[PDB]
Amino acid sequence: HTYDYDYVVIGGGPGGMASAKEAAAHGARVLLFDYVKPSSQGTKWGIGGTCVNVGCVPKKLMHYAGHMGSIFKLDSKAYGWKFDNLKHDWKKLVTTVQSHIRSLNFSYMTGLRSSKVKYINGLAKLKDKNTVSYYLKLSKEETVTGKYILIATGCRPHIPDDVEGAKELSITSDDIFSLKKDPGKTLVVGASYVALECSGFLNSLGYDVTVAVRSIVLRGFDQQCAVKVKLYMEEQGVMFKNGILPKKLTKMDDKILVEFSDKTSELYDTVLYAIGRKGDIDGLNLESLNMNVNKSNNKIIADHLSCTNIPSIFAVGDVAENVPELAPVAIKAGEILARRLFKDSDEIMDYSYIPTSIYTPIEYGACGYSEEKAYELYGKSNVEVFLQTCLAKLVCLKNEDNRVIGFHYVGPNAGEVTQGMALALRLKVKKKDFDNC
Amino acid sequence: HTYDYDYVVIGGGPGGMASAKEAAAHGARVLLFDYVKPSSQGTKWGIGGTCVNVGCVPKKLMHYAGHMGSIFKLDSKAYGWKFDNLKHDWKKLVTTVQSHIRSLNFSYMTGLRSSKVKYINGLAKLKDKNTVSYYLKLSKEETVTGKYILIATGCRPHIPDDVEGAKELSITSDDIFSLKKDPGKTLVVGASYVALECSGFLNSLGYDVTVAVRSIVLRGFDQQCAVKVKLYMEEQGVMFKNGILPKKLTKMDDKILVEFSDKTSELYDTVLYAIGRKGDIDGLNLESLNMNVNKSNNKIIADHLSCTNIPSIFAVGDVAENVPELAPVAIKAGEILARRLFKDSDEIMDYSYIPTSIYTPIEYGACGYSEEKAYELYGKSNVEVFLQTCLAKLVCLKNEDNRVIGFHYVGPNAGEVTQGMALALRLKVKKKDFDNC
Ligand SMILES: Cc1cc2nc3c(=O)[nH]c(=O)nc-3n(C[C@H](O)[C@H](O)[C@H](O)COP(=O)(O)OP(=O)(O)OC[C@H]3O[C@@H](n4cnc5c(N)ncnc54)[C@H](O)[C@@H]3O)c2cc1C
Numbered sequence A, B: 001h002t003y004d005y006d007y008v009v010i011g012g013g014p015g016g017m018a019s020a021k022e023a024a025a026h027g028a029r030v031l032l033f034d035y036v037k038p039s040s041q042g043t044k045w046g047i048g049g050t051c052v053n054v055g056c057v058p059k060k061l062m063h064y065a066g067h068m069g070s071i072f073k074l075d076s077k078a079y080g081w082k083f084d085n086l087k088h089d090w091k092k093l094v095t096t097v098q099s100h101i102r103s104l105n106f107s108y109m110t111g112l113r114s115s116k117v118k119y120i121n122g123l124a125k126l127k128d129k130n131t132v133s134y135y136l137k138l139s140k141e142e143t144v145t146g147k148y149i150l151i152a153t154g155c156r157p158h159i160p161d162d163v164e165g166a167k168e169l170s171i172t173s174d175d176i177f178s179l180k181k182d183p184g185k186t187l188v189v190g191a192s193y194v195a196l197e198c199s200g201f202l203n204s205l206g207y208d209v210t211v212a213v214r215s216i217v218l219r220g221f222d223q224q225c226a227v228k229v230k231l232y233m234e235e236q237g238v239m240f241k242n243g244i245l246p247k248k249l250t251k252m253d254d255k256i257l258v259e260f261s262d263k264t265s266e267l268y269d270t271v272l273y274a275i276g277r278k279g280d281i282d283g284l285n286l287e288s289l290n291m292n293v294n295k296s297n298n299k300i301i302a303d304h305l306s307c308t309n310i311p312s313i314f315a316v317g318d319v320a321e322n323v324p325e326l327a328p329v330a331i332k333a334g335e336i337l338a339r340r341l342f343k344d345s346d347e348i349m350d351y352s353y354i355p356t357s358i359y360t361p362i363e364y365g366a367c368g369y370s371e372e373k374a375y376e377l378y379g380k381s382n383v384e385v386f387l388q389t390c391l392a393k394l395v396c397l398k399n400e401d402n403r404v405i406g407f408h409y410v411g412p413n414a415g416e417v418t419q420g421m422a423l424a425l426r427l428k429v430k431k432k433d434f435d436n437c
């Protein structure tokens, strides 16, 4: 009618993509934007967003490389295997990782045209409630109109501005997976699942890794398991600086001089910041429409309907506040919105009992409620916990037939196990059913 | 005062163990026998039964050894890991395996007395409805009386008697996990999940294996997958002799000349039989009490309640007919019987939806009815199938909301995936649930 496109998505990640290929799968004409702003270290990559280029894919691949070395050094010789001169080539791992990422970048290209979604390689910005201005990447504007707009820009790794040298001298998850030079003696700053996973496979590869955590590691997860992971990581050679953080970074002849709140200065080889990520919003001119944005984390504020502060606009994925930063949790929410918008669907997003799996030296799969968080919502009185690397932790409700609220496992292949249990939780499994299984 | 014991258990395997302890855990005077008759190659072992000494445990340890290699060969180098002079010491592996097996041997021993279950290391024989005779291990016979008697003697590998030289020249699973000398060029006769697993890890270790099958592999599971597993094993270097079996085995300078039905005669270093296992009942004197036994496999015929024709005697584990040969399936079955007997329990053993995992080169975990099993039971119009190393087979009912009845996954970690999804099936999952997951 009087709109260039019915569906104008901003961001080519799993979410934005997942929704586009869905809106076009129901007739609607969809225009999709995706442009990778270079990292703080000038690193760039192809179409696919975070998960593919600097997330799940490269992360898991790296992990595997680290797990091999771990298997060789711990078990290999005990199981009758004999080998000589065991060494690891960093550049070989990267070339393999980056090679695979590129074969996906192309695999996703030939995917858009197949779904017939007009893809433009340019960074977009909000011109008007129904209009989207953009720059094709030289900068000359080009405007477009759409019946509905989706914001799926996700987030980008956060680096502190108050810390002198941090921004310029350190790297992030954005750079590590395509890093040319050897990581060398590495300092990892943060306690996220990313921070521990990175310092996790770096240590397994045989690097001098050191993690600086302000307070706790894996905040948001069950802390009885979090502590077991940290202890294990410490036994494997990962050293933690508890309560100490970098105050300033200085260059010293191809080495980084890090000064901690400790007043202690230990010069490292590579500094990696993984203190969290904040939504990529600053370039979307949102103040011009007074959108509901969370200042703390820079995310769009979205109701479960996925509707924004403005009726015309929507938000899905890592940009939405309180929405778990997972590839799958982002794909579905995008699928549903497409049906809500173009198939007159009545289904709404389900954010409960989604399983996450941290790929640390010792894996930690989690689905449902933490123990402590289950106490806040239901109280110790009404919450019962059971144990049942063969450790498993089941958190269930006292008052309603010990129905399982949460499930946590710190063991080999936790990712695999937790995924199955996740479906059992949705079917409202109960301890009764477990012991009798 | 009537009998010497309240409970007399013949068999020290998983089933016998689990039961005796559960019986003693509720106030019953329990006597338990266990005596490992030497293999056809004179191989003997400590207390714990099959799973521990010549089953699950060792099998899994061996597989893991082979798996390492497979990682070295296939993936190691691609991930930046370099090394020299890769070799495998068979002896080192057995000493590691056997060491662990012995650590368990002692664990269980100290466990029984810890649960106060009078244990005799003698092989038993039925004297009458509630009297058991046994011989210490010259001979003397000691009788003992019991209110309830349980037989849990499991099975032992089968070697054909019609084939000349087989019994004397060839080996079985009883032998391999403690084999002094190298297996060398190995011929594995049979297609059982044991048959494939063994030839699998032997192959992964780097031996010249050869599997002679009658017709099909893994009869009883979903053939669609059984074909995948065979194909993959072939690509990995396993040679299958289809529809060709040995008709005679001859000795020759430390090698064995195997003459096949093919009219072809080739020579191997080691010939392993895994064509199936038959219940160890022959020496129980059961035919004295006209027991109901399945003639083809020498198994006791069991009640849903684990009852024989003789109400004073019960049967559990692997000796019972149509009872799946899994360590867990024998424990739960042996623990219910105990409660049933000594704690007036009204509970019955459920056999449906029990998960198995085949540790072949490519793992294949299964749970629920097979595709052919489903059809014959429910009908093709009634049943629909859905397919997801990333592919899973779902066999669900058309008529009742596509409730899953069979889950088959051939992948990296089938065991884990199958285990989890197993519980889901018991909760009566639907394809509708899976799609939503
Ligand atoms: C190291 C790491 C490991 C992870 N591992 C896992 C895992 O194992 N499993 C899991 O489920 N999740 C994992 N995640 C999280 C997962 O990657 C994200 O939650 C998922 O990618 C969400 O995608 P999204 O569409 O919401 O945002 P994104 O995937 O980040 O997509 C946003 C895209 O839009 C583009 N863009 C941004 N701004 C603009 C603009 N204004 N104009 C045009 N284009 C723009 C960006 O280039 C970006 O590529 C991991 C994350 C990280 C960092």
Ligand SMILES: Cc1cc2nc3c(=O)[nH]c(=O)nc-3n(C[C@H](O)[C@H](O)[C@H](O)COP(=O)(O)OP(=O)(O)OC[C@H]3O[C@@H](n4cnc5c(N)ncnc54)[C@H](O)[C@@H]3O)c2cc1C
Pocket (backbone or CB within 6 Å): B010, B011, B012, B013, B014, B015, B016, B017, B033, B034, B035, B036, B037, B048, B049, B050, B051, B052, B054, B055, B056, B057, B059, B122, B123, B124, B125, B152, B153, B154, B155, B173, B194, B280, B283, B284, B316, B317, B318, B319, B324, B325, B326, B327, B328, B329, B330
């Ligand atoms: C190679 C192999 C691999 C396997 N892997 C797995 C697996 O991975 N997972 C799984 O769940 N299951 C596995 N199984 C099956 C599992 O081992 C059995 O199903 C389980 O051990 C059942 O034990 P049971 O107590 O019923 O009998 P058994 O374990 O065989 O116990 C019977 C015991 O009684 C003793 N006995 C026999 N006669 C007498 C006598 N008259 N007097 C005194 N004692 C006697 C025998 O010496 C024997 O030790 C495997 C089996 C094999 C052969």
